[PDB]
Amino acid sequence: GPHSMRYFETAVSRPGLEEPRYISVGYVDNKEFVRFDSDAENPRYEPRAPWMEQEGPEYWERETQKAKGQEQWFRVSLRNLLGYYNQSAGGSHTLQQMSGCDLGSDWRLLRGYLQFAYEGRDYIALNEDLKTWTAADMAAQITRRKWEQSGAAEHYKAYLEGECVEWLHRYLKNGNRTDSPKAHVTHHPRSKGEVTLRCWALGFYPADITLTWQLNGEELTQDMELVETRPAGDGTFQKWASVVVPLGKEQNYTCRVYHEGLPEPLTLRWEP
């Protein structure tokens, strides 16, 4: 199937902190596999999935020293952004980065990513051509011009097409899974003359899933309540969707569960 790598990086300043905290989290196929945190007693990239312990000490020493460089890059960048936005001393500020590459099922590069946010809002991103930058804010154009003048994107294009794909291939080798939903309906009467059917889906991975309720053969988009998909904490996820029905008519309501691990969608009903 398709594959990906991402590094999510955060630098955080708070008024009661002299220096920013820097965190970098690496992902392969949307699961964390390495993490660097400057708050640690001895900061270093650390393995976060057992298959990563395969890597030797000079891997970790090299990644760790890059992270120390990135930490300083974020510090300087947070200081410059403060001036760009005419923000004074004495607030909390955040710089975020996501970067990485998407691979098709043939393991070829589909797309590389490099995006930044300041205060949780889009600041500047490398466009899909890996050659030009998009920046919305007036304050952001200062960065775009600098990076255009320095030709920074050339180095980023080379990473996203080169090392990002090459090392992602190495990682997919070293760690060479879906779990299907298990579904049931629970019965809860909301009032006299009405009943809530709750369709649960439990124990599934990946997290993406869809639950619907159908009348005859009628999807009921509004009127139906749901929860955001949530981690069970064991690696799997959960969701439910519920709808209010006249009692006795429970049998004319069918729930459907859509998930990429299923041979076909599940259909189910309340079972006395």
Partner: peptide, 9 residues
């Protein structure tokens, strides 16, 4: 393998 940013913002 994490990317190395060059020029600061």
């Amino acid at each position: 393998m994490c990317l190395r940013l060059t020029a600061v913002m």
